[PDB]
Structure formats: structure tokens, C-alpha cells
Design a protein around this nucleic acid. Structure first.
Lengths: 52, 217, 188, 136
RNA sequence: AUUAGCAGUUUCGGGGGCGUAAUGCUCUCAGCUGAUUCUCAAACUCUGAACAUUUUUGGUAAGCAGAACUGGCGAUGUGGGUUGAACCAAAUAUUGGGAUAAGACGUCUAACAUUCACUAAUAGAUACCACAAAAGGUGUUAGUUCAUUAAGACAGCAGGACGGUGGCCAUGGAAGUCGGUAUCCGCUAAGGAGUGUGUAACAACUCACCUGCCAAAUGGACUAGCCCUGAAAAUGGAUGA
RNA sequence: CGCUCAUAGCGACGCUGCUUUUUGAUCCUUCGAUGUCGGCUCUUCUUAUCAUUGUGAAGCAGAAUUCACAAAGUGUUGGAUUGUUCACCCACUAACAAGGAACGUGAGCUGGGUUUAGACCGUCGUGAGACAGGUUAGUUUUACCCUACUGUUGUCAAUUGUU
RNA sequence: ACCUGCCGCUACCAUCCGUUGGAUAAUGGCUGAACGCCUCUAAGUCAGAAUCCAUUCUAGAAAC
């Protein structure tokens, strides 16, 4: 349950990809910043993961 | 540069000042070393050539050149073995930049050593190019090409203006293509001199290959 | 430059009906009379037989053509809803401060009492045509069923958003309401 | 610092003087004077003294006292403002002359508080209330 | 002025195994000389060019300073560039009609029709001229290259994704996957001593890799047109409106 | 660099920029005189947002920070020292962020400096005298005009009936 | 001159009073194509700042 729900939670928040400009959380298999101000950067960190 | 930001030494103007018998305070260039990799490696063993070339006439600094070289230096383990690597730049910063300094840096108004006798001490050593003159070259084997272009890519950022990368149809540092540069080996009329080539001499030489035979060895 | 578009289309079975009088459509079936409007990027649509439904477009861009597919998809979804309801089974998570959600149907509102020690109510009015039952297993799972995919889903999303903290880390609290199973359709 | 008021802040600000006013130490510790540097919580504006508390904590100094206590700043507590005020009540407490005590940065008064102490101050700072038999 | 190796050497410089140190063999260094290549020189050349614009000197540059040719405000305005000493049209007696010039032709404001593409941007809109760059962009338009594909594809989803074997190392252990190395073969349509996730570590999943179905296109890499990002400064605000 | 890990946070060597809040370069305007600097006073303005609010990141468990965006709506202090901005400590604070506006503001101020006459000291000078060398004392004039602004009368004579 | 001292004027040197709707930004989504998947976006749209604009408040047009 808690493992089956924590994963779900992660999927909705922690396991998406941020930008290296707008820091904007896109979606887990993203490829562009999807913003006008950025210019759809195409430079994307995956948002961090932690046990704590 | 150190005394300047390279925005005043972006574009070619004024006739060439150099390290001469008229100048003398002229500093030493930021690189006097221009090759990287196996210089022992043969003309024949490496048959792959990429160039870097500006599209606009611009004065590349010696420091800039150095920086460019030490991308391609570090893109070598990433490439795969320094053995399969040559480089030569082929643009030596011969020409020198003048700087009349502004004596005021924290305060104090000249109008006495202002803009009168205000002729540059030479500081800056730099190279001119045009709209296609080469600024880096890489001989290599046909293994590395996406590697070398990436090194060049890095190099592109370290240089002012819009550059370009073209792969020559030659064997790298040679005036023959490949269609030609097998016929020389195949027919066997080539003559070798380490990193260079020679070719036998019929329409190359005639007055000294008239009554001669040592000219077909 | 102009690459020429064309019609996608959608199939309408014989337990459901469709009208369309002025490029705007109201599909009807056993669940209800679910509606959505179109014509807005000069998007032409016409019905041929009580079986097909087609969105015609033959002069435009890629942009224009993108719309055509989307509209069709939407109508398909609507049809599906009208046949049998879209189900959104959410599940919440907390037991240090157990997350406690309550409801009213008819008025169609959901309210969250305890949530990460929040002593407030977070009331959020569901859109019209959304019911909510809950076969809970261990103080978890709410379901929201509805007919219009587009609206029910939105409502669910809103609810989810409401069960979220805006300060401190997100890997701290891994708690709130979370949609386990969307795009779920009951067996009729 | 500290800070703990109250419930409320026992209502409005009143002072005997702001910055640069002597008030007696009223303390068994050999501070004999207390001179204000400034007052805590005064955010203030353009040209306006950081003004004395009604029973609130102040940045102060021992100007004339023990030499050990002399120099070195000290958080204090105002106890009685010569200059007057109305309370939520309809009385006007007013005193002989200004006074306070040198204190800890958790508010706590050191020895025992001498003389009369306005009740507001006591309310504000429980230690004050504890360490006196006059709270008028 | 100045880079690169190559060749013949050097008991004529020096040090290593051999040899008298060796300059002899086998290595590197130093110097000379011979054949080639890199880049090149206002004060060099074997050789050689018919305030505005063009050339040019100093200057980080300036509406800075300084030259050349010619053109311009001086007895030279008019029409145009929103407005303006220098840009264009073009020269000024007083007139009328005509037809043009530069420049415009939604409305300001005399002056319109057509036809094709592009852009969707608080954008963009009359050289000078009142600013924009490097670098980004799965915005859209155009285009070039090579590749995949009826041995049936792309994208997707469905199935399979084995053994020698826990290869050798490190290592209770790390077995494809702390980390490192070699990285080989059997059987098969099919499977790297393995892309990641994960596991104390194995596994599990996922990938590479193969087939099912759907049913015809697909994939990369650049190139340049417009648009966007970059792109902040001070009274309210200027494609002239 | 950062245990690991180029870009969380930094970021060498190198390149492109903006800016007119430094100072220089400049000498186009003013020498038939724009009243030079500072501080008090006060509005308004710009954002390159210090706080605030709403957000997104982190090497973000929490508190505490750090980075990014929208955003100038509102806030952005009391002293000591110095002619003083600049400066330099103490003190509170949500924060004590940057600036502009003829280096905002002398018919609004004082004149602290700087800039005259008197003097002192030092140094330099045969001396008269010089000194971004110090020191000390050294008249801040005029609005009754035009406008702009504050508040106030008057007009609203085609705001249509003598109102 | 001094002590009182009224009316009055006045002191966070006293007292009382300073609201609520839609519209958006960033941003988080929803359905959802372009591009069978996938995507906050292209069509379409949900939430949402001290913001925006109204509400409230001052003046009241050669305006009725």
C-alpha cells in the first residue's frame, strides 16, 4: 500500500524533469521547457530523488 | 585580453603592425606551440580531414587561439587515443595590437598626456583572417569524426564570429583528394617525406629530369 | 505552405444519438445528454448517416488539421461517457494526521477536514454531473464517477491540487490525494 | 528579542523619554543607572527616536554603576514612565520619575525589583511578576 | 619573420644495454646540412591594380582628432526623407496647363487595383537614421544529405529477451549493473559476460535484440526565410500619429 | 570545483553583450556670467525585488539558508566618527536593495568644505611668492511678472422656460 | 511677574475608524492534438499574486 501509494505520489510530483533556466517541472519524459520566455530550451535536469 | 575585453579587437582595421625592428616592447604570443597529437604519424596512416574556418574577417587573439587548442586537447580521451590525432591551427598571431592607456584609472584629468602623443604601446598579439581562412585543422584516421567535430564545436564557442566546419576530400594536409591519393600509391609514383608527400617529377621537373634517371627511384 | 487537410471521423452505435445544428453537438445516450461546442478555428463538421460523424477540412495548415483530430477525439470521449460513465478512482495517503475527506452529492461538493494537521475545511465544488462513492479498504480511496470526461477529470485535478502543501519539501510529505486509476470505464 | 507579549502588547506605546534618557536601575546588582541606546521592536521611520517602552525590552547601558557592569550593552526592562498614559480602563498611571531594570535576554530580571512596577509590565514579563512584592 | 615532422649525419657535442663515452648497433638529446610543409612582414618583394560617399592615419571608440578624390549648406531655397546644414529629386525671375522625379497610394494626407507566398509576434513597417550580438528554440515556411521500409516498416502496444556462468578480479558479497578488466562461444527469429532502475548482493523490471498486430510511410543531420528567447534605467509615449 | 556528479550551487581559460548609477577620452552648447560640493526638505520615477505576496527550483527532513520567476502594490530605520556623498563601527528591524530625475532640489536652507582679500605652520623658492599640503576667520540679495501647482471667487449668455 | 484656568485649538504627549467582486501573471493542472504514443497548447479550458480592473472613497466636465 504505502509503497504502492508513495510511487504514485512521486509520479505526480518528484519524478518529472525541471529546466536549467526556468526550473519548471515538465513531465517525466520531457524534452523542451515549453515556455516562451525560456524559448523551449531543450536543456533538462530530471528533478532530484531522495530517501529523506 | 587582459587590458581589454576583445570588443575593440574584434574587427580588422589599420595596416599590419608586427614583432619587428621598429616595434620591440611587443609581447610574446600566448601560444608558440601549434601542434597536438602524433606528429610522427604519417601522411598515409591518417586519411581524414576537418577544418575550422571563419565566415567573417576578424582578428582572433592569441589567447583565444590557445583556448581553442585546449578544447581539442581535452577532447582526446573523449575522442579515443591521442595516437589517432593531429592538429596544426594554421593561423599564427603575427600582428600586434596597440594600447594608448588612460592614465586615469581611479581619478586625475590629463589634457597634457590626454590624447597627445597618444600612440599605443604594443600590447596584444593577434591573428587576422577573412571569410573562409582556416583557423584549426585536424588530420586523423577515419574512426574519429563525430568526436573531432564536437571538439571543433567546443572550439567554435571559444572564437569570435560565425565559424564553419568542412571535411576536406583530401588525406589531411595534402593537395590530393583520395581518388588521386590512391593512384599515387597504386601506380607507385609517390615519394614520401614523413608527415608530407612529394610525388615524382615530370610536369613538376623537366630541365633537371631531362637526362636523369635517379628521378624514378 | 498549405499542405491540405482532411477528415477524421467517429462511429456512433445504435444505443446512442447525435444532433448537430450549427457546428455544435449534443450526443445523447442512456446516461444523459452531454454537450460540447465547436466552430472556433473555422472548423467544418457534418453528419452522414446515423452511424458516421465527420469533421471536414481540406484547406489549411498543420495547425488547422491538429484541431480536427482533437475535436473528433473529444466527441468520441463524450459518446463513450454517454454510453457508460468515466470513472476516476483516487486514493489519498496519511495516518500521522489521517487525511479525512467528506462529501455531499446533489450539491456535489467535496471537503477535506484533516490534512497534514490543517484544522480547516478545504471545500471544493464539483462540476455538475459528478457522483462520489467509496469502497474504502483502510481509510483510503474515493471514487468520482461522471459522464463528461473533460469535466469530471478537471474536478478531480482540482481536488488533488487542494490536497497539497505549498511550503517546504515535496519529498518530505508524500501525502495528499492522488489519482490511481483514470480513464476507467465501468462494465455494463 | 526576547520576545513574548502578552496576550496583546498590553495596548499602546507610551514613554518617559526615548533614546538618551536616564532611568534608575531599581536592581540589587550594582548598576546604579540605566541609559538607553535604543528600544526593541522599534522599526521606526525617517527622523523619529526609538522611543521608550511602556513595559518593553530595551538596548541599554550602565553609564554610572559598577565598572564591571559599566560599558557593554544590556537588554533591560522599563518599569515606570515619569511621563503619563491612559489604559483600557480609563485610568492615567503616572510616576515620580522614570525607572527600569537590567535584565537577561530572555527578559529575566537579575536580583529583586525595587519600588513600584506597573501591572502591564508584569503581565508582559512573568519573571518580573515573580520577583517583586509591588505590582501596582 | 616563423611552425612541423622527414632524410643524410655528428669518435666533432653528451648519456644509456652492447661498444673505447660513442657520433657504430638499439634509444632519446644537441648541432650541421638536404628535400618538403605551416603561417607571413606599413617602414619587404622574385610580381604587379583603373559635412556625404568611397579610401585612409591615430584612437577602445566618439557627434573625437587628421589627410586624399569627388560631391554638397556661401547671391540656394523648392519637392521628398514624420521633423532636420550635409542623403535623394533638383536648382531658386512672375504666371498658367501638361507630364514626370524622389517618395508615397487604409485614415491622417492629393494617390488604387490585382495576384502568390510569409508572420500570429505588446511583433513588424520610408538607406543615412536615431541600436542590437554570441548563443538557444519539437514555432512555422522553404531546402539539402544520407539512412530505415513491403525479407511489412515508423510510432504504439502484445509476447519472448536463454545457457556455459557466481567468467576473471576486487571479494562473507557485489552474479551484466560499488568499482575494474578481458569482453569468448553455444542454441535460436532472439538476446551486450549488458542501457538504466533496483537489489546488502542475487532477483525483478527496463533497454539493446527478436517476433505478433495495426497497415505506409519513416529516421537523423544540417542549411536559411520570417517569429520567438537573449532583450534591464530612470516625467507619459511614440513604424511620425 | 562540488564525496559521487560539468550547468543544485559555482564555474577556469575564452567569446558576445547591455548600461550610462564610476571615471576618463572628448570640447558640440553656455565666459555680455546656467550660482560650484555636501547635508537638511520633498515629490515623483526606474528596476538590476532587500523585505513583502503568489509561485518554481536545491547539494530542501525540519528550522535555516541558498538559487529562479511574476511582481515597483506597500515598506526600505536611530546613532557614533568625518565638510561629505563614498566611507567606517554600534543599535534595532520584515528589510534596512540598487539607482534616476540639469551628478533632482541656494529668489527653499545653513555654508561644513572648495573659491578671493587677513593670517599660521610646514615645504619649496636669492625674493615677490607657490603648494588635490594642513590650519583658522571670512556680507547666501530680488517674485509685486508669466506660467505651472495649492486652495477660492466668477462664468457655464444656447449648461436654451426673466430663474 | 507668579499660581490656577474656561470655552476654544490641539498631542500614537489622547480617542475612534481604514471593505469586497470579477480579470489576469508566474505557476500547478485538465481534456487534447500537431507527431496512432506523448505532451498545461496549437484549437479549447480549469485553478491562481501585495498584481489588474472594478466595489468602497475625494473632486464633479462649455456633461446630462
Amino acid at each position: 500500500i504505502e509503497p504502492s501509494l508513495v510511487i504514485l505520489a512521486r509520479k505526480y510530483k518528484c519524478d518529472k524533469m525541471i529546466c536549467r533556466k526556468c526550473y519548471a517541472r515538465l513531465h517525466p519524459r520531457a524534452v523542451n521547457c515549453r515556455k516562451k520566455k525560456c524559448g523551449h530550451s531543450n536543456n533538462l535536469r530530471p528533478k532530484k530523488k531522495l530517501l529523506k | 585580453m587582459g587590458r581589454r575585453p576583445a570588443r575593440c579587437y574584434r574587427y580588422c582595421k589599420n595596416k599590419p603592425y608586427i614583432k619587428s625592428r621598429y616595434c620591440r616592447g611587443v609581447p610574446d604570443a600566448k601560444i608558440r606551440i601549434f601542434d597536438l597529437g602524433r606528429k610522427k604519424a604519417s601522411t598515409d596512416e591518417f586519411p581524414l580531414c576537418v577544418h575550422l574556418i571563419s565566415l567573417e574577417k576578424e582578428q582572433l587573439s592569441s589567447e583565444a587561439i590557445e583556448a581553442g587548442r585546449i578544447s581539442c586537447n581535452k577532447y582526446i580521451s573523449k575522442t579515443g587515443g591521442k595516437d589517432s590525432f593531429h592538429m596544426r591551427v594554421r593561423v599564427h598571431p603575427w600582428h600586434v595590437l596597440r594600447i594608448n592607456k588612460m592614465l586615469s584609472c581611479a581619478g586625475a584629468d590629463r589634457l597634457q598626456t590626454g590624447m597627445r602623443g597618444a600612440f599605443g604601446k604594443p600590447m596584444g598579439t593577434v591573428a587576422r583572417v577573412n571569410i573562409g581562412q582556416i583557423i584549426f585543422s585536424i588530420r586523423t584516421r577515419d574512426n574519429m569524426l563525430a568526436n573531432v567535430v564536437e571538439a571543433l564545436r567546443r572550439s567554435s564557442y571559444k572564437f569570435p564570429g560565425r565559424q564553419k566546419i568542412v571535411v576536406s576530400k583530401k588525406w589531411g594536409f595534402t593537395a590530393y583528394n583520395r581518388e588521386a591519393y590512391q593512384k599515387l600509391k597504386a601506380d607507385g609514383r609517390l615519394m614520401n617525406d614523413g608527415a608530407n608527400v612529394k610525388v615524382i617529377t615530370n610536369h613538376g621537373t623537366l630541365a633537371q629530369y631531362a637526362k636523369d634517371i635517379a628521378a624514378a627511384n | 505552405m498549405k499542405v491540405i487537410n482532411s477528415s477524421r471521423k467517429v462511429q456512433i452505435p445504435e444505443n446512442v444519438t447525435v444532433d448537430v445544428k450549427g457546428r455544435s453537438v449534443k450526443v445523447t445516450g442512456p446516461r444523459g445528454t452531454l454537450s460540447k461546442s465547436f466552430d472556433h478555428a473555422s472548423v467544418d463538421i457534418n453528419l452522414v448517416g446515423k452511424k458516421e460523424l465527420t469533421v471536414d477540412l481540406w484547406f489549411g495548415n498543420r495547425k488547422q488539421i491538429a484541431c480536427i483530430k482533437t475535436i473528433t477525439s473529444i466527441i468520441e470521449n463524450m459518446i463513450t461517457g454517454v454510453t457508460k460513465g468515466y470513472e476516476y478512482k483516487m486514493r489519498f495517503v496519511y495516518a500521522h494526521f489521517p487525511i479525512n475527506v467528506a462529501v455531499t452529492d446533489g450539491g456535489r461538493v467535496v471537503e477535506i477536514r484533516n490534512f497534514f494537521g490543517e484544522k480547516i475545511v478545504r471545500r471544493i465544488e464539483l462540476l455538475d454531473g459528478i457522483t462520489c462513492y467509496r469502497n474504502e479498504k483502510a481509510k483510503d480511496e474515493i471514487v468520482l464517477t461522471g459522464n463528461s470526461l473533460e469535466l469530471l477529470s478537471q474536478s478531480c485535478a482540482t481536488i488533488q491540487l487542494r490536497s497539497a502543501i505549498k511550503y517546504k519539501d515535496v519529498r518530505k510529505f508524500l501525502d495528499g490525494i492522488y489519482v490511481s486509476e483514470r480513464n476507467v470505464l465501468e462494465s455494463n | 528579542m526576547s520576545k513574548a507579549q502578552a496576550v496583546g502588547s498590553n495596548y499602546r506605546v507610551s514613554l518617559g523619554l526615548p533614546v538618551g534618557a536616564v532611568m534608575n536601575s531599581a536592581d540589587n546588582s550594582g548598576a546604579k543607572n540605566l541609559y538607553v541606546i535604543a528600544v526593541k521592536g522599534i522599526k521606526g521611520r525617517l527622523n523619529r527616536l526609538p522611543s521608550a517602552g511602556v513595559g518593553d525590552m530595551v538596548m541599554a547601558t550602565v553609564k554610572k554603576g559598577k565598572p564591571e557592569l559599566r560599558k557593554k550593552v544590556c537588554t533591560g526592562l522599563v518599569v515606570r514612565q515619569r511621563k503619563h498614559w491612559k489604559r483600557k480602563d480609563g485610568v492615567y498611571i503616572y510616576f515620580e520619575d522614570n525607572a527600569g531594570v537590567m535584565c537577561n535576554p530572555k527578559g529575566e530580571v537579575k536580583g529583586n525589583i525595587l519600588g513600584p512596577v506597573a501591572k502591564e509590565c508584569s503581565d508582559l514579563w512573568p519573571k518580573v511578576a515573580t520577583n517583586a512584592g509591588t505590582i501596582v
